[PDB]
Design a protein around this ligand. Structure first.
Ligand SMILES: C=C=CCNCCCC/N=C/C=C(\C)N1c2cc(C)c(C)cc2N(C[C@H](O)[C@H](O)[C@H](O)COP(=O)(O)OP(=O)(O)OC[C@H]2O[C@@H](n3cnc4c(N)ncnc43)[C@H](O)[C@@H]2O)c2[nH]c(=O)[nH]c(=O)c21
Ligand SMILES: C=C=CCNCCCC/N=C/C=C(\C)N1c2cc(C)c(C)cc2N(C[C@H](O)[C@H](O)[C@H](O)COP(=O)(O)OP(=O)(O)OC[C@H]2O[C@@H](n3cnc4c(N)ncnc43)[C@H](O)[C@@H]2O)c2[nH]c(=O)[nH]c(=O)c21
Ligand SMILES: Oc1ccc(Nc2nc(-c3cnc4ccccn34)cs2)cc1
Ligand SMILES: Oc1ccc(Nc2nc(-c3cnc4ccccn34)cs2)cc1
Ligand SMILES: [Cl-]
Ligand SMILES: [Cl-]
Lengths: 462, 462
């Protein structure tokens, strides 16, 4: 028949791998997808004539980005100030916000010269914040009331950083000569029609029989003495294979590696799985009848005055809501309506995922009332939100550079099992583009290219 | 190697099968048992120097019973009146109980002449009760107060019958010339040391490596084009086999047959699985500090005066307790202490299994107070009870003759799949001894004898 290839997962990596193989005339290819849908951590949701992204939101980069090339080639591409509010209703002055912002940028840049690896990243933030904290307290020409606001903004800024995959994702943005945090102009693009359109363009080539939806794998049996690999599905089907490409998230690997592989994985790969970090990042959309936020406001930034002294990382499960750093006003209102877009990251995101919509909605409304100083804000007409952490096909949003891991661990995760029987793909297997759509895509093409090369050589031999 | 034989389950049928094969020099035998223990629906529990049975309690029969032969050969074998109480505390007179008992026995025997199959069984009870109900109401020489008691005892007697596997299990007992329900003398024997001792005597022959405890099967793959059978365990191990003997309960088959077999079972077997009935029967033990029941009382029989008109079968989930027909006083007190032994059968048993011990205990204590007329009865020191229905390795206590099934369905369940690739054992596969320990044992020996015969012939051929 030619090589039997099972691709596990139909996110960007799985589809990229399958397309690349089929493009090379690989006849005997099957994709097994656990969920009812393709796209994985690309999940687009339509409400009215407007799309909301629950997963991947922006295309990072331009020329060279193969997902930018897709979006651009099929024509899928194309205000105010941020409003800092205290938990006692009062708004923080332009001056105070600008002063803090300037101090932080000065210290963060001076510090990043001082200290490019995963452990050394952490040190920048830790010592930045200590140095910023010292200068605020030490500044003799500041009233004590204002010092307590600025010190609380350290905790606010820390919540903003929490959602980032690296320091390098936070090295895109720099501070403007007029106190605003300006991103590089052509860096981040949205797809108004939805990010799923890219998934569908990628899947277009692939025949319909290849992709098996609602078909999760239970175990990969490799090193067999017919196919020397056997894929065991949850519905108990035994699929013989020559090669397998695993694209499931690092979070799936962390929870299932002991059962998922027979025999067990080599111990350096198991160590890599443990050492590498995957974070839970969820999106919360709050659609209101009309805007209670001022027209100058791009966003509503939450500075809790009682967090001046805290060096907190994780909140208790009652204070999960305190992990939200603020809400962005979606523009334009005509496309999206009056919708606030929020992010929550880490253990507090898993706590949010357990709550019902009416509960999450209520707590966000309570927050917004307290911060705005208007207690009359109605409950939002609609709410939309993700649950990547508790979903057993994801168990996380994206891989990040954890203190006590390295680029060495990604190479170890990405390394194939002997005879290329089992190949490792997915965002977390990409050395430099991990936690992105293009990393996911390129990782799929890498493992495909590996089998492609193996059988160009068995044509060049034979 | 000689034939690879996987036996699924290490209850009486699985052990009987494995022993019989090994006795015949079958080298390559494995038993896979889901639970941590052997014995299955034989489960013995020690408290003090005394054993309580949660499953199989009595050896039914003597000479010819191969479980009697075991018990007898290893030397493991060797009061008052039943007290009928109303839910308003008052005790029902000797006369009233004897009169009812005589009427019922007369009608039940006259009726059983009128109508030996599974559907025709049901008709006996239905018309017995209607005829008994008529004569009570019709009797001109009875006060109305007494008629309402006797009519409630129909519902009581119906609860007693509910726990029986057949009419033939209720054809052992007959009525004495002095109004008592007398069992045949040498019919039922207990094992004071515990029923598990029989399980252990049966397992004695078998080497330790053969039985894999804590090892449930997920799927049997048969009809494979190495072993033409593959047993798929829950921990994802693939065990190649030539023959498999399935001994799991009818309840396990009802819930799992669609996933458990690949390809699917022949449709007459699937029909047999649906047609055959398995009931949930649980035991409740209530150990008290001292006896509040009178010394004349073998048992405390519960007659609810408000059930005179009802033709109930299933109670709602709040009235689950009403399915208990009474409690037996265990004899002798020196062995067991002051322990009441109760039975609950059907859907109401599953409702009991969901409740906590403190809850079940409380409701039984409440019942006992109301019926005795003593509200001062303390909460029992200990409680012990079974959960056969909710246990996923049982999902029932024993197979019964359901209206709309026949002996034909048992033959259909018991029939092996082609090439004797998969063999069907267990109590519910025995034509006449279903719902017994000896039926279970003999069913195991039958499937063993089948493979034994197959390979005496492949020795006589070769
Ligand atoms: C002013 C002001 C302030 C504004 N601040 C701006 C800061 C913004 C910084 N950028 C942030 C971007 C985020 C957060 N973005 C973001 C947000 C959020 C909420 C998420 C969740 C992610 C992202 N990323 C990451 C990507 O989405 C992710 O890497 C890829 O989709 C993964 O593809 P894959 O490897 O194939 O895995 P998959 O999991 O997709 O596929 C594997 C499949 O396997 C299946 N499966 C599982 N188990 C199985 C089994 N047992 N058997 C069979 N199948 C099985 C499973 O169902 C899947 O379909 C982003 N990327 C990007 O490019 N742009 C972005 O903006 C974001
Ligand atoms: C005065 C006055 C009034 C007094 N009234 C007197 C009336 C009394 C009438 N007699 C009543 C008797 C009862 C109720 N008795 C009674 C009471 C109660 C509460 C019960 C629960 C039963 C009974 N019976 C029935 C037997 O116990 C039963 O038939 C056998 O144990 C079954 O053996 P097996 O077929 O091998 O199955 P198993 O299930 O045991 O074995 C299969 C194994 O498979 C395992 N398994 C499941 N799934 C698996 C997977 N996926 N992979 C691997 N393994 C898996 C599983 O864990 C098991 O170990 C009795 N029999 C008897 O002889 N005397 C009796 O007294 C009673
Ligand atoms: O694409 C972006 C990203 C961020 C922002 N805006 C804000 N950034 C920060 C912030 C926190 N920590 C640091 C460290 C370095 C630089 C910025 N920051 C606070 S608000 C706008 C556009
Ligand atoms: O091994 C036994 C079984 C039962 C009893 N005692 C009682 N049996 C009945 C009863 C109900 N229905 C019928 C129909 C026919 C015969 C009896 N019964 C009520 S109390 C004692 C020993
Ligand atoms: Cl969006
Ligand atoms: Cl007992």
């Amino acid at each position: 028949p030619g090589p039997r290839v099972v691709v596990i997962g139909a996110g960007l990596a799985g589809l990229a791998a399958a397309k690349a193989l089929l493009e090379q005339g690989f006849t005997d290819v099957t994709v097994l997808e656990a969920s009812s849908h393709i796209g994985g951590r690309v999940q687009s949701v339509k409400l009215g004539h407007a799309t909301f992204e629950l997963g991947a939101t922006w295309i990072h980069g331009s020329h060279g980005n193969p997902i930018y090339h897709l979006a651009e080639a099929n024509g899928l591409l194309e205000n105010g100030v941020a409003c800092y509010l205290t938990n006692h209703g009062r708004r923080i002055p332009k001056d105070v916000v600008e002063e803090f912002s300037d101090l932080y940028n000065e210290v963060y840049n001076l510090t990043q010269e001082f200290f490019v690896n995963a452990e050394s990243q952490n040190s920048v933030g830790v010592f930045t914040r200590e140095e910023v904290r010292n200068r605020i307290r030490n500044d003799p020409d500041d009233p004590e009331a204002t010092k307590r606001l600025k010190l609380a903004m350290i905790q606010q800024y820390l919540k903003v950083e929490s959602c980032e995959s690296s320091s390098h994702s936070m090295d895109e943005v720099s501070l403007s000569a007029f106190g605003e945090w300006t991103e590089i102009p052509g860096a981040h693009h949205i797809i108004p029609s939805g990010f799923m359109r890219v998934v569908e363009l990628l899947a277009e080539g692939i025949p319909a029989h290849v992709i098996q939806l609602g078909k999760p794998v239970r175990c990969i049996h490799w090193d067999q003495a017919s196919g020397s690999v056997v894929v065991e599905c949850e519905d108990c089907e035994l699929i013989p294979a020559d090669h397998v490409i695993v694209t499931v998230s690092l979070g799936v690997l962390k929870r299932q590696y002991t059962s998922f592989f027979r025999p067990g994985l080599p111990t350096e790969k198991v160590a890599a799985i443990h050492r590498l970090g995957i974070g839970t990042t969820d999106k919360i959309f709050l659609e209101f009848e009309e805007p209670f936020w001022g027209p100058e406001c791009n966003s509503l930034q939450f500075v809790w005055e009682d967090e001046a002294e805290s060096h907190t990382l994780t909140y208790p499960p009652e204070l999960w809501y305190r992990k939200i750093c603020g809400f962005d006003v979606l523009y334009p209102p005509e496309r999206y309506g009056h919708v606030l877009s929020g992010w929550i990251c880490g253990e507090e995101a898993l706590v949010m995922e357990t709550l019902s919509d009416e509960a999450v909605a209520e707590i966000c409304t309570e927050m917004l009332r307290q911060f705005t100083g208007n207690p009359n804000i109605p409950k939002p007409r609609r709410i939309l939100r993700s649950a990547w952490g508790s979903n057993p096909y994801f168990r996380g949003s994206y891989s990040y550079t954890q203190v006590g891991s390295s680029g060495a661990d990604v190479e170890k995760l990405a390394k194939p099992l002997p005879g290329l029987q089992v190949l490792f793909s997915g965002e977390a297997t990409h050395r430099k583009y991990y936690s992105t759509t293009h990393g996911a895509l390129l990782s799929g093409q890498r493992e495909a290219a590996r089998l492609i090369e193996m059988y160009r050589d068995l044509f060049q031999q034979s």
